[PDB]
Amino acid sequence: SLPVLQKESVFQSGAHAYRIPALLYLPGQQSLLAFAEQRAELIVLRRGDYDAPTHQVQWQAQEVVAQARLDGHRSMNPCPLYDAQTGTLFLFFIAIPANVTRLCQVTSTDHGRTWSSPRDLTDAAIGPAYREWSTFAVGPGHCLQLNDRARSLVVPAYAYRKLIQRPIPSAFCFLSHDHGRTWARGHFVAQDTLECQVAEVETGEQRVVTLNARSHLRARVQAQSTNDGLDFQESQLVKKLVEPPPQGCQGSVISFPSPRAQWLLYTHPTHSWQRADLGAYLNPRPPAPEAWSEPVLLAKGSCAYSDLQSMGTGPDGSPLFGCLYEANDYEEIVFLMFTLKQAFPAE
Ligand SMILES: CC(=O)N[C@H]1[C@H](OCC(C)C)OC(C(=O)O)=C[C@@H]1O
């Protein structure tokens, strides 16, 4: 694999098993919040202080987000987000005991230390369609906050829809313009799209929300939005971003300040038929589908779900990246930290 600043497991199978990582960077505190599902199923958390001089992040003790759950329900798919205009930390998740899935959220005003009680967002965020679905989910992974005047909150999601045939999945985004006070359900993207993530890319003059989703084909599906996620113009398959047919695998995408507005970074297993070899792909001409690069190798061996966070400027001057990913046959969640220079010397 390529050179990295740090490589350590932060969650490890033992008394419990850990899966479905989500990473969040709190810019002003130079630190990260690493969430995971603890499988009696809850969401756990780990806070890490990043120290540049020593090129390392120090992880504190694992904690349970006691408030992120409903009585008699298991919690899944932790989707974190930090509101830069309020200083409020959001943690969206799914609670499960014919649709019976619930959308929830818990907030923290002290950087994750404590959390408000949950808020069941289901009925108002979904409406009548709720009955037309089999189930649904958000993320997993970090969410997105836009540049629009209202600094809208965009939460990536997908739903299993029912038209004889099994429910077909379609990605979409939950949108809030009042800082998570109310929520609207965005429009689906091409059918058969699942777990996805969204990144904002300011190109030309207008904002462009790019969406990268898991599919049932040998390739990834990517869609674009010019209306903050309400509608996703069109979606194209991206041959350069493989999906092992077994059923595919969740992937992560983020935007970051270009070295010369922003570029995209994407992580996902690179093996054609197996969930192995975590690779990093770079898109310097976002969101062009054909601009995606060959993958650079980050981790060898079995790798599954992952989540990326832009961490500012790295020790070498280039963009810094933190990555949380499932590994060794789901025996742990590994935290990886590296720079644009370490991953793409040529760019
Ligand atoms: C909410 C939930 O059950 N998520 C599952 C996810 O469902 C994929 C379906 C929708 C095709 O599958 C996997 C997986 O290892 O591929 C682990 C997640 O925990």
Curated annotation (Swiss-Prot):
Motif FRIP motif located where?
A: 18-21
**Active-site residues from the entry:** Y305 (nucleophile), E326
A GO molecular function assigned to this protein is: exo-alpha-sialidase activity
Sequence positions that bind substrate: R19, R39, Y158, Y160, E195, R214, R275
Where does this protein chiefly localize?
Answer: cytoplasm
What are its GO cellular component terms? catalytic complex; cytoplasm; cytosol; lysosome; membrane
What is one Pfam family matched by this protein? Answer: BNR_2
Biological-process GO terms, alphabetical: ganglioside catabolic process; glycoprotein catabolic process; glycosphingolipid catabolic process; oligosaccharide catabolic process
Q: Where in the cell is it found?
A: Cytoplasm, Cytosol
Q: What is its EC number?
A: 3.2.1.18
Gene3D superfamilies annotated for this entry? 2.120.10.10
Protein origin, superkingdom: Eukaryota
Effect after changing E195 to A/Q: Loss of enzyme activity
Q: Which InterPro entries match?
A: Sialidase, Sialidase_fam, Sialidase_sf
Family, as annotated? Belongs to the glycosyl hydrolase 33 family.
Q: Return the protein name.
A: Sialidase-2
Q: Which organism is it from?
A: Homo sapiens (Human)
The encoding gene is: NEU2
